[PDB]
Amino acid sequence: LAAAAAQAL
């Protein structure tokens, strides 16, 4: 999940 979120940017 942390990576999914980071992907926003």
Q: At 6, phi and psi to the nearest 5? A: -50, -35
Q: What is the rounded distance in angstroms from the CA atom of residue 9 to the CA atom of residue 7?
A: 5
HSE of 1, CA atoms in CB hemisphere, 13 A:
0
Cα-Cα end-to-end distance for the chain = 14
HSE of 5, CA atoms in CB hemisphere, 13 A:
2
HSE of 3, CA atoms in CB hemisphere, 13 A:
0
Cα–chain-centroid distance for residue 1?
Answer: 7
Tell me the resolution in Å: 1.1
